[PDB]
Design a protein around this nucleic acid. Structure first.
Lengths: 105, 108
DNA sequence: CAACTGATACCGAGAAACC
DNA sequence: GGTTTCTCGGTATCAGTTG
């Protein structure tokens, strides 16, 4: 139970994802890159990495077993972030597009 | 456990399309497992889940608001957890038009 | 129907709530 | 002690939009 919140915090603190950064000292709001896969500025490795990391973490994707599908990984994390009460996107603040999310206690 | 019989009675009834026996031994059956849209036979397909909530007194006409999603859910959570039935995943078919799941009645 | 979306239907694991 | 429902935290499909 409650794997998403802790996992995403760990992924931000990890520093393995460029653009996945905190935006205040309290570690309560963060920015998340949201590049479109069609556009040219879409570096496949770096812009799909966090979604692939969430599919791997939950066992939905297994390397060398299943066909990669970045669009499904993207949709899975978005649907999860919308559903979860722990996160709330701040829309008035969302070439390098992104989203901003606040963590609620 | 009123489920295990309740179900053979509804199969032998045949009051539900897509809900058939698979052998003359009365031991393996199909149960339709369609995904709702926004509504396309929203009452023919919901009949079994309605029947189950009516039976177990979870839905009394004129007292509760109808709710197809939770009628199918309850019946499905019951069938999967039940010990009187097992699913034959190798024969289930969730990738066709008019899809279904196949179960076996274990004797006891 | 490529990628993407919100809204909604759906699912399984415990945790109750019944029987 | 034995079945069925309830909770919860996600995941999947629908009916479109290009977010």
């Amino acid at each position: 139970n409650g794997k998403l919140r802790q996992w995403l915090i760990d992924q931000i603190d990890s520093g393995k994802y460029p653009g996945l950064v905190w935006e205040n000292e309290e570690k309560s709001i963060f920015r998340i890159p949201w590049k479109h896969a069609g556009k040219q500025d879409y570096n496949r490795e770096e812009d799909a990495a966090l979604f692939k990391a969430w599919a791997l973490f939950k066992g939905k994707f297994r390397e060398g077993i299943d066909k990669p599908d970045p669009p499904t990984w993207k949709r899975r994390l978005r649907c999860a972030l919308n559903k979860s009460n722990d996160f709330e996107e701040l829309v008035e603040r969302s070439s390098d597009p992104y989203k901003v999310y606040r963590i609620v206690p």
